[PDB]
Design a protein around this motif. Structure first.
Motif, PDB file in Angstrom:
ATOM      1  N   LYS A 167       0.837  -1.204   0.000  1.00 49.20           N
ATOM      2  CA  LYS A 167       0.000   0.000   0.000  1.00 49.20           C
ATOM      3  C   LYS A 167       0.875   1.259   0.000  1.00 49.20           C
ATOM      4  O   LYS A 167       0.535   2.260   0.630  1.00 49.20           O
ATOM      5  CB  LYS A 167      -1.009   0.003   1.169  1.00 49.20           C
ATOM      6  N   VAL A 188      -4.882  -8.527   8.858  1.00 50.47           N
ATOM      7  CA  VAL A 188      -6.072  -8.347   8.003  1.00 50.47           C
ATOM      8  C   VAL A 188      -6.025  -7.067   7.147  1.00 50.47           C
ATOM      9  O   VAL A 188      -5.494  -6.045   7.578  1.00 50.47           O
ATOM     10  CB  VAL A 188      -7.360  -8.362   8.872  1.00 50.47           C
ATOM     11  N   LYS A 191      -2.786  -9.475   1.515  1.00 54.73           N
ATOM     12  CA  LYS A 191      -2.240 -10.818   1.375  1.00 54.73           C
ATOM     13  C   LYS A 191      -2.880 -11.521   0.179  1.00 54.73           C
ATOM     14  O   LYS A 191      -2.174 -12.103  -0.648  1.00 54.73           O
ATOM     15  CB  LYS A 191      -2.475 -11.628   2.654  1.00 54.73           C
TER      16      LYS A 191
HETATM   17  N1  LIG Z   1      -4.124   1.211  -1.894  1.00 54.20           N
HETATM   18  C1  LIG Z   1      -3.991  -0.114  -1.811  1.00 54.20           C
HETATM   19  N2  LIG Z   1      -4.985  -0.844  -1.294  1.00 54.20           N
HETATM   20  C2  LIG Z   1      -4.725  -2.181  -1.291  1.00 54.20           C
HETATM   21  C3  LIG Z   1      -3.583  -2.826  -1.742  1.00 54.20           C
HETATM   22  N3  LIG Z   1      -3.704  -4.197  -1.574  1.00 54.20           N
HETATM   23  C4  LIG Z   1      -4.894  -4.356  -1.041  1.00 54.20           C
HETATM   24  N4  LIG Z   1      -5.571  -3.179  -0.845  1.00 54.20           N
HETATM   25  C5  LIG Z   1      -6.949  -3.040  -0.352  1.00 54.20           C
HETATM   26  O1  LIG Z   1      -7.176  -4.036   0.621  1.00 54.20           O
HETATM   27  C6  LIG Z   1      -8.482  -4.604   0.446  1.00 54.20           C
HETATM   28  C7  LIG Z   1      -8.457  -6.047   0.882  1.00 54.20           C
HETATM   29  O2  LIG Z   1      -7.160  -6.610   0.585  1.00 54.20           O
HETATM   30  P1  LIG Z   1      -6.859  -8.153   0.722  1.00 54.20           P
HETATM   31  O3  LIG Z   1      -6.085  -8.684  -0.460  1.00 54.20           O
HETATM   32  O4  LIG Z   1      -8.099  -8.922   0.967  1.00 54.20           O
HETATM   33  O5  LIG Z   1      -6.021  -8.282   2.051  1.00 54.20           O
HETATM   34  P2  LIG Z   1      -6.023  -9.510   3.042  1.00 54.20           P
HETATM   35  O6  LIG Z   1      -7.075  -9.311   4.108  1.00 54.20           O
HETATM   36  O7  LIG Z   1      -4.666  -9.498   3.667  1.00 54.20           O
HETATM   37  O8  LIG Z   1      -6.282 -10.653   2.138  1.00 54.20           O
HETATM   38  C8  LIG Z   1      -8.850  -4.400  -1.022  1.00 54.20           C
HETATM   39  O9  LIG Z   1     -10.228  -4.071  -1.142  1.00 54.20           O
HETATM   40  C9  LIG Z   1      -7.968  -3.230  -1.481  1.00 54.20           C
HETATM   41  O10 LIG Z   1      -8.719  -2.034  -1.651  1.00 54.20           O
HETATM   42  C10 LIG Z   1      -2.507  -2.000  -2.300  1.00 54.20           C
HETATM   43  O11 LIG Z   1      -1.435  -2.387  -2.766  1.00 54.20           O
HETATM   44  N5  LIG Z   1      -2.819  -0.652  -2.285  1.00 54.20           N
END
Ligand SMILES: Nc1nc2c(ncn2[C@@H]2O[C@H](COP(=O)(O)OP(=O)(O)O)[C@@H](O)[C@H]2O)c(=O)[nH]1
Ligand SMILES: Nc1nc2c(ncn2[C@@H]2O[C@H](COP(=O)(O)OP(=O)(O)O)[C@@H](O)[C@H]2O)c(=O)[nH]1
Lengths: 87, 34, 107, 335, 106, 86, 335, 33
Positions: G78, H12, H16
């Motif tokens: 991010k 979270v 990921k």
């Molecule tokens: N700005 C930004 N938002 C991100 C990025 N990666 C994920 N997100 C946000 O994080 C949300 C959920 O990410 P997710 O892949 O499910 O993360 P997890 O919970 O670790 O699996 C998405 O709706 C994206 O908007 C990134 O590289 N940049």
């Protein structure tokens, strides 16, 4: 013949001139050696081999018959110990 | 010592099984003092 | 055709027997040690040790008679020789164990 | 664990004390008739005069015969709603027809025309009808036969051999009395055998006699250890027989009750537990029924792989892997 | 203090052994009957009967060797005598069973 | 050292011994593992050798190392092997 | 049955093939690290630059060291949201501090500043950052040691006695190679013993040698049937030892997974299943923790009543009455 | 080719599931696309 009541005086269970201590009586049923009065009667009615108690408990004799060995006091009627003969 | 007896109520829904169970115990109480 | 349920039972038999034999090894070791301790102490101080020893024998007797698991000859001989538990048998076993008897044996 | 919701009410007529068991749900009545807390010594069928008999009035009556509810009394109810006598006479004719189909003497069945509601509200005219009913409770339903009065039966738990005399078998006497010298049969699993008691002991109480209730050891002369096993029964000769095939009424536990998650089909090979042992059996579902859902009651024919001493009314549990998945009663022995 | 779990195992041992012995009685009976049938029919018609007989022996052998349940002498003798399953052992057993042999013997 | 077991669809073969496919698999399945090791023990035990009592052609009965075996010294086939009678 | 929800993605760098395992729920990551389908040879920690590290970033890192995840790479994510370099340098300093606490070399841990979203959308500037990461995957994570390369280990399943020659033990080889004539130790349950292989057979493949993979029978000269048992292991001498006490990371099954209904307390005496056999053990819960709820992970100290051959990383199951109630990994052997 | 098992960990919403998808997409397009 007919039903003979087993009496309990707090310390012993008694019937037909035989007796067992409370705890020894209960232990035998609990360990899977039921009907201790029936067992002891079998010994007494088997023309058993009679000898002094080898451990020397006073009043007691060792009786052997019907597949069992018993330590028994002919005066008090108490069965002090009864078990199957050595395999 | 009085004779013990187990009974029960059977039948279709809404026909009055729960009502009759209550009605029996109420009347006999009132009459014989059960 | 009973074989599928028969196999299930047989597998259960194999597993439980394996486990029982292991438990028997622990009883055997623990008893060897109690016998040793009893033979190295005076009669009064041996009483709680005898209480443990006969408690174990009682459990091993329950195994033999109630559940009908027939153990190795050593444990069978032990179940016989140590069945009687009173002052007079304790006096006898204490003496024998003090003179160097390591496991219950016939006089 | 099964779950049964019941209401226990207790009342007294001048001669007898009654324990009344009513259930909220249709499903609870079934659960209770098959695996009672207590066995009904008689039942009170309730038919509305508004509706006459309905789908479930048939179900409960049939269950009665299958379970072995001995006597049934009718309380034709909601009579305050209907005026004409002729219409009632017609409903009573139908209800007796129904009872007669399932081998209850319908012609000879008592039928009280009453109102339960008016009676509970305190209306003297209809209260008499309740008192009439409890008259029929006193007269039509006999006291059930007490355990100790029946033919002798001991399920075998343990066996202890004494050399040169016989074998001692233990268990808790189910009914009747055993005295030294009586002949007994050993029934189930193996071919039946006879023997004589040469010794009895009832734990802490009696020598040479044993009574329904506390544990009994029975010495059988000439019976060797390998000729008897747990799960057999000792019985007064000719009073119980071994069978492998029987009709049952069965309740299958729901998942929430600790039972199955999925339904079973006609090739189900569960264990059936009778008294002191479980035995594998196969099943025959009734016509049209392809599967039994967790939570269903149903009638099934069972064929055990080993015979079991049994009579009609004998309860059993159904088990899989050690878990209870159903409960049943022997409806009709077959062979 | 191992006794509580030991008792649980012992109870399981008692129950499973009880059950195995019952199953062994059924194998024994079923085999007595196959032997009888085989001895009352011709060699060709006996083949599917022998297939059942040896299939049972194979299961009883699995019991002995894989799970190490040691059965009564009768079944032990059967496991030995009927282990070999081919044309030549079938010819031998058919003859013996036809002449009135009720259980495998040497 | 390591000697490869060959399989030709019908037999498993190694060190001049052979077992049929099904018999080989049956032995492992029934809790009698390592049939080549068992048969070699017999062959190396100065076994008692007699004709096959059932008369299978080419076969002999060998007894040693606690086992009895029916074996064809020409083909190397072990037709049957089991512990001696208890 | 336990339930683990995972996503299995597969990709190729020009030199290596990768099998990537991500999980939706926090609870699933734990379930997978302890009873993973496969063991991670390296992990990709993901920290947002928006939030820095959080409660679970600590949990996963600690689990890493407990489970035995060998190497960890960071993808500070991010970064499209944060403009300032100085702020990022600060977050990286915290993340290295964190990793250093749990014995991961934080100072020379690789850290890629990227955006996963911009990269997945197809934005060339941030795609380079992904390619940078997979460079560190190629360089920082070595290939794990293959089974067949390790010291020999065979868990014993069955034992078959041959008169006058010895005992044949069977099982599936876990690692390494056994050849005829090599010395082996028999480890666990009993006092260790040594013996020599006088014969080996690998099912359908080899005589006098056996390789990790298919089943092996091993003939041990001079070992009698009663001196060896299922649950022991054969091992190259001096490479594995028996132990009774160890620290574990454990996941307790939920009720819905077929596990316990109620929590357990410090006097819990379950069975612990290692490789081929279950052994009773007692437990020491960590400071402050009075009970473990179905569905929890927990770190516990276990004391077995019989020794078991074990090394750090060894997985085990926790059982009660024959049912699986938990799963664990040996964190640290104690003695 | 050498086989290697890796995985994604972390808190979270940190990305990921996104990074798992981004890796397989890029490497596909770059190396042997
Ligand atoms: N700005 C930004 N938002 C991100 C990025 N990666 C994920 N997100 C946000 O994080 C949300 C959920 O990410 P997710 O892949 O499910 O993360 P997890 O919970 O670790 O699996 C998405 O709706 C994206 O908007 C990134 O590289 N940049
Ligand atoms: N008029 C009238 N209504 C009745 C009588 N008995 C029952 N009911 C009505 O039937 C309704 C349901 O009966 P209930 O006791 O629940 O029977 P259940 O469904 O078998 O338990 C109640 O609301 C009563 O008002 C009766 O004798 N007369």
């Amino acid at each position: 013949g007919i039903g003979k009541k087993i009496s309990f005086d707090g310390d012993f269970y008694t019937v037909d001139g035989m007796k067992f201590s409370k705890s020894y009586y209960e232990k035998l049923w609990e360990q899977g050696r039921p009907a201790p009065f029936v067992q002891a009667r079998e010994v007494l009615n088997s023309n058993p081999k009679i000898e002094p108690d080898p451990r020397g408990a006073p009043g007691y004799l060792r009786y052997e018959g019907a597949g069992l060995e018993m330590i028994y006091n002919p005066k008090t009627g108490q069965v002090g110990h009864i078990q199957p003969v050595k395999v | 010592t009085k004779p013990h007896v187990n009974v029960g109520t059977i039948g279709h829904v809404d026909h009055g099984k729960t009502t009759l169970t209550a009605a029996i115990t109420t009347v006999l109480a009132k009459t014989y003092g059960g | 055709d009973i074989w599928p349920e028969f196999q299930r039972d047989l597998e259960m038999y194999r597993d439980v027997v394996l486990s029982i034999k292991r438990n028997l090894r622990l009883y055997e070791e623990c008893i060897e040690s109690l016998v040793h301790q009893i033979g190295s102490t005076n009669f009064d101080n041996a009483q709680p040790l005898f209480d443990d020893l006969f408690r174990m024998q009682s459990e091993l007797a329950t195994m033999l008679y109630k559940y009908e698991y027939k153990p190795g000859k050593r444990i069978q001989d032990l179940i016989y020789h140590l069945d009687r538990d009173d002052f007079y048998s304790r006096k006898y076993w204490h003496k024998k164990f003090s003179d160097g008897l390591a496991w219950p044996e016939a006089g | 664990g099964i779950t049964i919701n019941t209401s226990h009410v207790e009342y007294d007529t001048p001669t007898r004390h009654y324990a009344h068991v009513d259930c909220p749900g249709h499903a609870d009545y079934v659960k209770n008739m098959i695996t009672g807390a207590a066995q009904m010594d008689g039942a009170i069928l309730v038919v509305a005069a508004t509706d006459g008999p309905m789908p479930q009035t048939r179900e409960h009556i049939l269950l009665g015969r299958q379970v072995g509810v001995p006597y049934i009394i009718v309380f034709l109810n909601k009579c305050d709603m209907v005026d004409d006598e002729e219409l009632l006479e017609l409903v009573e004719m139908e209800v007796r027809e129904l009872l007669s189909q399932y081998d209850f003497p319908g012609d000879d069945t008592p039928i009280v025309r009453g109102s339960a509601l008016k009676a509970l509200e305190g209306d003297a005219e209809w209260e008499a009808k309740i008192l009439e009913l409890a008259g029929f409770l006193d007269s039509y339903i006999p006291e059930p036969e007490r355990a100790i009065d029946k033919p002798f039966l001991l399920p075998i738990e343990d066996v202890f051999s004494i050399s040169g005399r016989g074998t001692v078998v233990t268990g808790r006497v189910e009914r009747g009395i055993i005295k030294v010298g009586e002949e007994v049969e050993i029934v189930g699993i193996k071919e039946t055998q006879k023997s004589t008691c040469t010794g009895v002991e009832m734990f802490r109480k009696l020598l040479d006699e044993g009574r329904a209730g506390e544990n009994v050891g029975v010495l059988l002369r000439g019976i060797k250890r390998e000729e008897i096993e747990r799960g057999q029964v000792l019985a007064k000769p000719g009073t119980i027989k071994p069978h492998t095939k029987f009709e049952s009424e069965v309740y299958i536990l729901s998942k929430d009750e600790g039972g199955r998650h999925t339904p079973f089909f006609k090739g189900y090979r569960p264990q059936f537990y009778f008294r002191t042992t479980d035995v594998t059996g196969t099943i025959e579902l009734p016509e049209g029924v392809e599967m039994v859902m967790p939570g269903d009651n149903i009638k099934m024919v069972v064929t055990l792989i080993h015979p079991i001493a049994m009579d009609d009314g004998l309860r059993f549990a159904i088990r899989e892997g050690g878990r209870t998945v159903g409960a049943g009663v022997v409806a009709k022995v077959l062979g």
